[PDB]
Design a protein around this ligand. Structure first.
Ligand SMILES: [Cl-]
Length: 246
């Protein structure tokens, strides 16, 4: 019986690589981006959970799975959602965007395994609030992800806060391909997004989330820009726990 081959043995997870993703069911819906409103713009007032959280057993409620959400990327039916709370002046938020997120896009989001949902948590004061307003103005025109990447790539060498102001946000919007710069510049400055930013902050504070970036990866809370390999290990563990979304 030595002249035969069997399938690979199962190994302890430290040697298993991608066992959660191997056995998970990819999502197939909402891979092509957010669903627009009737006029072709997007609902940049989306925030919050899918449903009120009352206890720890409600943790999955932080994931919206709202097809209209212009702050989300990846399948609306992905088996795993990453909920992120982030601040555009925060160098740890910048480092996650610049150094971890692209790997997660390549290995999980493009494959329908993971959806990533942004939530505002401005902690750094006036520039962070102004940046969040600009991000919502970009999202209204379907360019949140491109705006986020332009802004955070411009912070890649900054150990503190960039102290971005309106002309910086307008440049990032141009870089992102925002088509209506008059609407962008107006909404980046005026009261349009003041109410939702207050509600988004109050929602995060109600969960006790006070530091950026913060994540709920499936059922698991992660505080801070932990190493890419830690995010991969938690994603694989959470996909093993819950391989399929119905
Ligand atoms: Cl809640």
């Amino acid at each position: 019986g030595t002249q035969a081959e069997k399938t690979a043995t199962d190994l302890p997870p430290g040697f298993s690589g991608k066992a959660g993703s191997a056995n998970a069911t990819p999502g197939t819906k909402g891979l092509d981006g957010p669903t627009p409103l009737a006029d072709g713009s997007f609902d940049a007032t989306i925030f919050g959970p899918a449903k009120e959280l009352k206890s720890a057993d409600d943790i999955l409620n932080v994931h919206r799975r709202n097809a209209k959400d212009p702050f989300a990327v990846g399948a609306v039916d992905a088996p795993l959602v990453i909920t992120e709370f982030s601040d555009f002046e925060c160098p740890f938020s910048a480092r996650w965007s610049n150094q971890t997120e692209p790997t997660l896009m390549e290995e999980y989001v493009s494959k329908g395994l993971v959806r990533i949902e942004w939530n505002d948590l401005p902690v750094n004061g006036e520039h962070a609030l102004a940046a969040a307003k600009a991000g919502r103005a970009a999202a209204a025109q379907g360019k949140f992800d491109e705006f986020r990447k332009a802004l955070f790539e411009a912070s890649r060498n900054v150990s503190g806060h960039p102290n971005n102001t309106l002309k910086d946000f307008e440049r990032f919007a141009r870089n992102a391909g925002v088509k209506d710069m008059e609407r962008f510049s107006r909404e980046a400055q005026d009261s349009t997004y003041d109410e939702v930013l207050t509600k988004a902050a109050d929602y995060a504070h109600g969960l006790g989330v006070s530091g950026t970036p913060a994540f709920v990866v499936g059922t698991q809370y992660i505080s801070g820009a932990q190493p890419t390999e830690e995010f991969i290990k938690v994603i694989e563990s959470e996909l093993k726990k819950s391989p399929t979304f119905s």
